[PDB]
Design a protein around this motif. Structure first.
Motif, mmCIF file in Angstrom:
data_model
loop_
_atom_site.group_PDB
_atom_site.id
_atom_site.type_symbol
_atom_site.label_atom_id
_atom_site.label_comp_id
_atom_site.label_asym_id
_atom_site.label_seq_id
_atom_site.Cartn_x
_atom_site.Cartn_y
_atom_site.Cartn_z
ATOM 1 N N UNK A 55 0.819 -1.174 0.000
ATOM 2 C CA UNK A 55 0.000 0.000 0.000
ATOM 3 C C UNK A 55 0.869 1.246 0.000
ATOM 4 N N UNK A 58 2.417 1.704 -3.389
ATOM 5 C CA UNK A 58 1.445 2.030 -4.432
ATOM 6 C C UNK A 58 1.033 3.481 -4.353
ATOM 7 N N UNK A 59 0.910 3.983 -3.151
ATOM 8 C CA UNK A 59 0.549 5.362 -3.025
ATOM 9 C C UNK A 59 1.557 6.304 -3.554
ATOM 10 N N UNK A 60 2.816 5.936 -3.369
ATOM 11 C CA UNK A 60 3.905 6.810 -3.715
ATOM 12 C C UNK A 60 4.013 6.956 -5.183
ATOM 13 N N UNK B 55 -5.002 -2.269 -1.474
ATOM 14 C CA UNK B 55 -4.376 -1.117 -2.083
ATOM 15 C C UNK B 55 -5.406 -0.263 -2.737
ATOM 16 N N UNK B 79 0.189 4.406 6.192
ATOM 17 C CA UNK B 79 0.833 4.311 4.873
ATOM 18 C C UNK B 79 0.636 5.536 4.010
#
Lengths: 106, 106
Positions: A55, A58-60, B55, B79
């Motif tokens: 997670x 993926x956000x980054x 995600x 996160x």
RNA sequence: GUAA
């Protein structure tokens, strides 16, 4: 710091594969130096690690055309997008196969 | 739908717990109708399911103060954040415990 | 929920 990445580039996406030594602690997220990537391309993320890591990663990469999360059973599942790939779409990739011959993990 | 949510709301976050019937397919992400939540609060996400689901979900709450992903071993791992909490921080919650007595899964 |  104690976690290494590989970055494979293709026209339609850049695969990012991580490897982790032993157990990880969440603290490590304060210190990960994320691979820089061509932003005109969606990203596929793979690696054996816990869910929070994926997670986080993926956000980054949200600023990219899309983010797909690999799953050895299915392929790469789009989980977010700004491109014509839609969430739930599946990119046909086999990571075990692409990493044959072995790849420098920087 | 193939998927039900529960939302437990608390001063310091809104916990969102999901439950899944069967093995899911990625297609389902095109259909999930996500619980709407008090934006003055970070979110914690929990549920047994594959990575791409988490995600996906975490992304969908990115408009909030933070997103933490639950891990039964540790607690809730931040996160993403726009509040005081930093990525890698751990919120102390036990989901198996908060769900005792049963919670209506809408 | 260490590629449910």
């Amino acid at each position: 710091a104690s976690m290494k990445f590989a970055v494979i580039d293709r026209k339609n996406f850049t695969l990012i594969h991580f490897e982790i030594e032993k157990p990880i602690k969440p603290e490590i997220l304060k210190e990960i130096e994320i691979p820089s990537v061509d932003t005109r391309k969606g990203v596929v993320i793979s690696g054996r690690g816990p869910i929070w890591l994926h997670c986080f990663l993926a956000h980054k990469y949200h600023h990219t055309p899309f983010v797909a999360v690999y799953d050895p059973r299915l392929g790469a599942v789009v989980v977010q997008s700004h491109s014509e790939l839609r969430e739930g779409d599946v990119i046909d990739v086999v990571v075990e196969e692409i990493l044959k011959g072995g790849v420098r993990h920087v």
